[PDB]
Design a protein around this motif. Structure first.
Motif, PDB file in Angstrom:
ATOM      1  N   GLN A 124       5.670  15.533  62.205  1.00 32.85           N
ATOM      2  CA  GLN A 124       4.625  16.304  61.522  1.00 32.85           C
ATOM      3  C   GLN A 124       3.251  15.637  61.539  1.00 32.85           C
ATOM      4  O   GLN A 124       2.416  16.034  60.739  1.00 32.85           O
ATOM      5  CB  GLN A 124       4.964  16.624  60.054  1.00 32.85           C
ATOM      6  N   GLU A 126       0.024  17.938  62.615  1.00 33.98           N
ATOM      7  CA  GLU A 126      -0.386  18.863  61.569  1.00 33.98           C
ATOM      8  C   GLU A 126      -0.872  18.116  60.326  1.00 33.98           C
ATOM      9  O   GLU A 126      -1.769  18.589  59.619  1.00 33.98           O
ATOM     10  CB  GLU A 126       0.769  19.817  61.261  1.00 33.98           C
ATOM     11  N   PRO A 159      10.085  21.890  60.774  1.00 34.45           N
ATOM     12  CA  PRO A 159       9.014  22.087  61.759  1.00 34.45           C
ATOM     13  C   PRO A 159       8.997  23.462  62.391  1.00 34.45           C
ATOM     14  O   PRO A 159       8.008  23.790  63.050  1.00 34.45           O
ATOM     15  CB  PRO A 159       9.298  21.007  62.806  1.00 34.45           C
ATOM     16  N   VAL A 160      10.038  24.278  62.197  1.00 35.26           N
ATOM     17  CA  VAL A 160      10.153  25.562  62.890  1.00 35.26           C
ATOM     18  C   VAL A 160       9.103  26.560  62.404  1.00 35.26           C
ATOM     19  O   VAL A 160       8.750  27.503  63.121  1.00 35.26           O
ATOM     20  CB  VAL A 160      11.600  26.097  62.733  1.00 35.26           C
ATOM     21  N   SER A 210       5.898  25.595  61.468  1.00 33.97           N
ATOM     22  CA  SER A 210       4.585  25.120  61.886  1.00 33.97           C
ATOM     23  C   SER A 210       4.636  24.335  63.192  1.00 33.97           C
ATOM     24  O   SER A 210       4.028  23.269  63.301  1.00 33.97           O
ATOM     25  CB  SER A 210       3.952  24.271  60.789  1.00 33.97           C
ATOM     26  N   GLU A 211       5.377  24.839  64.182  1.00 37.99           N
ATOM     27  CA  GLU A 211       5.269  24.310  65.538  1.00 37.99           C
ATOM     28  C   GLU A 211       3.891  24.574  66.118  1.00 37.99           C
ATOM     29  O   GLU A 211       3.312  23.714  66.792  1.00 37.99           O
ATOM     30  CB  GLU A 211       6.330  24.942  66.438  1.00 37.99           C
ATOM     31  N   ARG A 212       3.349  25.764  65.867  1.00 42.13           N
ATOM     32  CA  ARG A 212       2.117  26.178  66.523  1.00 42.13           C
ATOM     33  C   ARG A 212       0.900  25.565  65.847  1.00 42.13           C
ATOM     34  O   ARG A 212      -0.160  25.428  66.467  1.00 42.13           O
ATOM     35  CB  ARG A 212       2.025  27.700  66.521  1.00 42.13           C
ATOM     36  N   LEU A 262      -1.087  25.075  61.627  1.00 44.95           N
ATOM     37  CA  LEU A 262      -1.396  25.890  60.454  1.00 44.95           C
ATOM     38  C   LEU A 262      -2.651  26.716  60.723  1.00 44.95           C
ATOM     39  O   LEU A 262      -3.780  26.329  60.427  1.00 44.95           O
ATOM     40  CB  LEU A 262      -1.558  25.029  59.212  1.00 44.95           C
ATOM     41  N   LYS A 274      -0.101  30.092  57.082  1.00 42.32           N
ATOM     42  CA  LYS A 274      -0.274  29.740  55.674  1.00 42.32           C
ATOM     43  C   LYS A 274       0.123  30.883  54.750  1.00 42.32           C
ATOM     44  O   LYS A 274       0.710  30.658  53.692  1.00 42.32           O
ATOM     45  CB  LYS A 274      -1.717  29.331  55.401  1.00 42.32           C
ATOM     46  N   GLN A 277      15.885  19.692  69.906  1.00 45.16           N
ATOM     47  CA  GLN A 277      14.686  19.904  69.108  1.00 45.16           C
ATOM     48  C   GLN A 277      14.022  18.588  68.730  1.00 45.16           C
ATOM     49  O   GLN A 277      12.837  18.582  68.384  1.00 45.16           O
ATOM     50  CB  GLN A 277      15.047  20.718  67.863  1.00 45.16           C
ATOM     51  N   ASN A 304       9.970  17.880  68.836  1.00 43.15           N
ATOM     52  CA  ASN A 304       9.235  17.630  67.605  1.00 43.15           C
ATOM     53  C   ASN A 304       8.476  16.316  67.633  1.00 43.15           C
ATOM     54  O   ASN A 304       7.644  16.080  66.753  1.00 43.15           O
ATOM     55  CB  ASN A 304      10.171  17.625  66.399  1.00 43.15           C
ATOM     56  N   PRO A 317       6.197  23.386  71.162  1.00 43.61           N
ATOM     57  CA  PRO A 317       7.192  24.249  70.517  1.00 43.61           C
ATOM     58  C   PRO A 317       8.485  24.314  71.315  1.00 43.61           C
ATOM     59  O   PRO A 317       8.476  24.322  72.548  1.00 43.61           O
ATOM     60  CB  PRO A 317       6.496  25.611  70.463  1.00 43.61           C
ATOM     61  N   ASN A 364      13.199  28.569  70.054  1.00 47.72           N
ATOM     62  CA  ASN A 364      12.623  29.349  68.964  1.00 47.72           C
ATOM     63  C   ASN A 364      11.844  30.529  69.542  1.00 47.72           C
ATOM     64  O   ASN A 364      10.627  30.636  69.409  1.00 47.72           O
ATOM     65  CB  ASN A 364      11.744  28.471  68.083  1.00 47.72           C
TER      66      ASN A 364
END
Lengths: 50, 150, 49, 294, 49, 62, 147, 34, 49
Positions: A22, A25, E1-2, E4-6, E8, E13, H20, H24, H29, H33
């Motif tokens: 993460q 992001e 993470p599924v 917000s892979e792309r 925000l 949101k 995955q 990640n 992506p 999915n």
């Protein structure tokens, strides 16, 4: 005096954990203050000067 | 290699070191393409003074003469800049204060400080000079100010 | 029932930490192990093991 | 020394008809989206903007774009070559309609404004239609446009009032182009030039006010001496305009509008994606050159 | 993470604030809901894990 | 002694020499084409020394 | 003021031949795949028949000619190296601070090249899984055609 | 020696992956999915 | 990941993350009486003292 970031060529240590999840992001909407990206031509140890 | 080292012949203080620290990676025009250079050539405000009236055409008219250089390092005794060859691939960092979003395949051009002189002018009182910075702007506003200024 | 430490971990500024703490305004944590990576055995990539 | 080779893969093989149409245009300057080497078919040609065309949106795009030259057409893929500033290459004259280049000329890169047979190649193996630009010598490249800009204006007066334009006088002086001692009969059946004719005529009425308003304000002892000479070239009727009939907030917006159609119309004819040919063979059609942007 | 892979954007949101509300109404006070559910002890254990 | 240190910084910063392939003799054409092909093939591999040989190139234009 | 810790991720990746995805593919690594352009292996496939005694014409043996091709996939990983990082790789050094700066040029080039070599082992597992997904029609189609 | 979590489905042994983790880390992506 | 579609490939990235301490201060209270401190000193009197 506030504690500030510095890009000096430290001997960084290696952890068992991964940190990667993460982050892209979390840099956008701040999970943590006081960060700095480094893209390709500038992702290195800076030259030591004193 | 190509570089420009610029002396600070007296000294400089700790407030204007933090003022020159925030202005790192910014393009300034300087006088001559010598390796050694003093403080009098780096200012765009050698013509844009405070006690005299500025001349925003002649300031801009001065800007197509000069060589243009990017700062790398701010030291208390010197300022080490890197220059720009007339046909050269290089890197420029969007530091500049009215934030306009760029993208790939855009068309930049260097303009005088035309919205806030006081932001661009930081004064170096330890040497009796002020160094003045231009602003790099895409040409859709590069022309549109010169349409408006005339 | 679980197993855990009986006391805290110690950190003392004795040694070469004390010179840079007095002369400069900073001080490491574990200067000695930090020294053995830079000057005693350089260009060794970090490895978890 | 350095790599410049933009391998354009294809998701499917080309047809036997579609392959041989690209075999002809093997030396051809093409605009191209990005500078890296692994790209798809949707990045090449002017089909990103031209596949209902507009003039200035393509002409301003050809300055900001990355140009490249064909070198090889295999069945499953293509291969190009990126064209750097001051970089020697070897272009083949292939462009329909044929214009007969010459050595020691200055070839300019223009948008296409002729039919959809001469300009583009329609591919249906992949669903994209690649569009070739108009590489014409620079002196002919403007005479081919300033006469069709004349044709596009007078074909709008005769649509509104047909008794003002002579059709026989029109296609005797516009459809012929004389350059280098040769006559090129062009092909006209023009929605390309509907951006210029609305910019050049919207500038046509602001100039007689704009050169009197700019002379009545700039009168002083320190007048530049050549403007005394061009004080007489302005006609009699232009020097009878009353500038009091428009309000002061209206005379600002007839300069800021006027100065934008002065520059943006001047900029697109002083665009420099041109290239200097220094050798040309009239029967092999192969020409050496060097690219020079702006 | 599924989710917000792309990244925000604006549409992610609003699709997360919709999930803040639905998780607040259903799954709150989860140890109080174990009495009235017939499954019960397996619901808390999937909640608390 | 210090001029011998400068004799290394000169001889390590020079451009590589242009290859001379003799087209008049027979067994000197074999030894000259081979040192193109044995030396270009080590300017393409992804190791560090083969990337070290690709950085010395000096592209002066004509 | 202190400096209480200094830490960094080390990225390890399970390569292609160690995943379970190689249970669904056969791997025959070739020396230079640039040599051959297109694979055009041709198969002669012959079905069996049932001997009938019915009123139609007798059963003839059948061959089917099946033409299998080779799809090529091309990958590039990009690497930037700094110009001040290049310049002190060639430079002569003797002082112990220019050995720990030369160690900073050899731990960057060997880290920006194990970056790009890692990205090609990520490029195997991507371009095998993208091939498996371009030849996987869904259940609702295939269940009835498979019957 | 290949590490995989096998499962028996009626009569056949079938390995089960999930890739995955390597999508990640790189912030691309995952292709499953859809 | 390096993949050879129509994407423009990414160069190498790098993140640098800074953390800081947070100070904390705890208080307490002791009230010692007047004569408590006063008779802490005199002795060699009667065994009641």
């Amino acid at each position: 005096m506030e504690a500030t970031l510095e890009q000096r060529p430290f001997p960084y240590l290696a952890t068992e954990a991964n940190l990667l999840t993460q982050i892209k992001e979390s840099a956008a909407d701040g999970l943590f203050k006081s960060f700095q990206l480094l893209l390709g031509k500038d992702a290195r140890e800076g030259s030591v000067r004193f | 290699d190509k570089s420009i080292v610029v002396n600070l012949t007296s000294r400089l203080f700790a407030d204007e070191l933090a003022a020159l620290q925030s202005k790192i990676g910014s393009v300034l025009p300087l006088g001559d393409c010598h390796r050694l250079q003093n403080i009098q050539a780096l200012g765009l405000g050698c013509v844009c003074s405070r006690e005299t009236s500025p001349d925003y055409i002649q300031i801009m008219q001065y800007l197509s003469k000069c060589t243009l250089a990017v700062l790398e390092e701010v030291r208390p005794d010197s300022l080490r800049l890197t220059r720009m060859d007339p046909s050269d691939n290089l890197q420029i960092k969007n530091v500049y204060a009215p934030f306009f979003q760029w993208d790939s395949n855009t068309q930049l051009a260097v303009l005088p400080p035309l919205f806030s002189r006081k932001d661009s002018t930081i004064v170096l009182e330890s040497n009796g000079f002020d160094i003045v910075f231009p602003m790099v702007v895409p040409q859709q506003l590069g022309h549109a100010i010169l349409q408006q200024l005339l | 029932a679980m197993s855990g430490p009986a006391a805290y971990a110690s950190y003392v500024v004795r040694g070469a930490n004390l010179v840079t703490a007095v002369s400069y305004g900073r001080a490491m944590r574990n200067f000695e192990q930090f020294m053995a990576r830079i000057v005693d055995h350089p260009n060794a990539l970090p490895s978890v093991e | 020394a350095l790599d410049k080779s933009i391998v354009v893969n294809l998701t499917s093989r080309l047809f036997a008809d579609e392959l041989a149409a690209l075999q002809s245009k093997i030396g051809s300057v093409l605009p191209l989206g990005d500078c890296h080497r692994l790209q798809n078919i949707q990045a090449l040609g002017l089909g990103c903007v031209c596949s209902s065309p507009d003039y200035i949106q393509i002409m301003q795009y050809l300055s900001k774009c990355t140009l490249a030259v064909l070198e090889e057409v295999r069945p499953d893929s293509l291969r190009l070559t990126r064209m750097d500033p001051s970089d020697n290459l070897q272009i083949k004259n292939v462009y329909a309609p044929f214009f007969q280049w010459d050595s020691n000329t200055q070839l300019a890169v223009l948008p296409p404004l002729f039919s959809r047979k001469d300009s583009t190649i329609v591919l249906e193996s992949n669903g994209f239609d690649i569009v070739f630009p108009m590489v014409v010598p620079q002196q002919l490249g403007h005479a081919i446009l300033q006469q069709l800009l004349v044709y596009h204006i007078y074909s709008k007066i005769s649509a509104g009032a047909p008794g003002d334009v002579n059709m026989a006088e029109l296609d005797l002086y516009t459809t012929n182009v004389s350059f280098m001692g040769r006559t090129y009969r062009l092909d006209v059946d023009l929605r390309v030039l509907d951006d210029l004719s609305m910019y050049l005529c919207i500038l046509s009425a602001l100039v007689p006010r704009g050169c009197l308003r700019l002379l009545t304000a700039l009168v002083r002892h320190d007048r530049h001496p050549l403007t005394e000479v061009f004080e007489g070239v302005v006609p009699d009727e232009v020097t009878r305009i009353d500038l009091d009939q428009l309000s002061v907030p209206d005379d600002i917006t007839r300069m800021r509008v006027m100065f934008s159609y002065l520059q943006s119309l001047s900029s697109i004819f002083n665009l420099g994606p041109r290239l200097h040919v220094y050798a040309y063979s009239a029967e092999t059609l192969a020409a050496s050159c060097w690219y020079s942007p702006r | 993470p599924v989710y917000s892979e792309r990244g925000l954007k604006k549409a992610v949101k609003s699709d997360m604030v919709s999930m803040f509300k639905a998780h607040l109404i259903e799954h709150s006070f989860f140890l109080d809901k174990a009495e009235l559910m017939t499954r019960g002890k397996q619901y808390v254990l999937t909640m608390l894990s | 002694e210090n001029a011998a240190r400068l004799g290394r910084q000169v001889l390590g910063l020079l451009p590589p020499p242009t290859h001379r392939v003799s087209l008049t003799r027979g067994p000197e054409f074999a030894r000259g084409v081979r040192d193109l092909l044995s030396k270009y093939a080590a300017s393409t591999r992804p190791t560090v020394g083969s990337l070290h040989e690709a950085l010395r190139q000096a592209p002066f234009r004509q | 003021e202190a400096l209480l810790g200094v830490y960094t991720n080390v990225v390890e990746f399970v390569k292609f031949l160690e995943t379970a995805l190689a249970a669904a593919c056969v791997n025959t690594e070739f020396k230079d795949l640039r040599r051959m352009i297109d694979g055009k292996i041709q198969f002669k496939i012959s079905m069996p028949t049932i001997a009938h005694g019915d009123g139609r014409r007798p059963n003839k043996q059948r061959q089917y000619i099946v033409m299998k091709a080779c799809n090529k996939h091309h990958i590039g990983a990009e690497i930037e190296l700094a110009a001040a990082d290049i310049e002190l790789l060639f430079a002569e050094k003797e002082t112990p601070l220019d050995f720990t700066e030369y160690a900073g040029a050899i731990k960057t080039i060997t880290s920006a090249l194990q970056f790009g070599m890692d990205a090609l082992e990520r490029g195997l597992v991507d371009t095998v899984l993208a091939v498996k997904l371009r030849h996987a029609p869904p259940v609702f189609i295939l269940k009835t055609l498979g019957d | 020696r290949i590490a995989a979590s096998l499962v028996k489905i009626g009569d056949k042994f079938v390995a089960i992956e999930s890739l995955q983790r390597m999508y990640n880390e790189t912030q691309f992506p995952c292709p499953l999915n859809r």
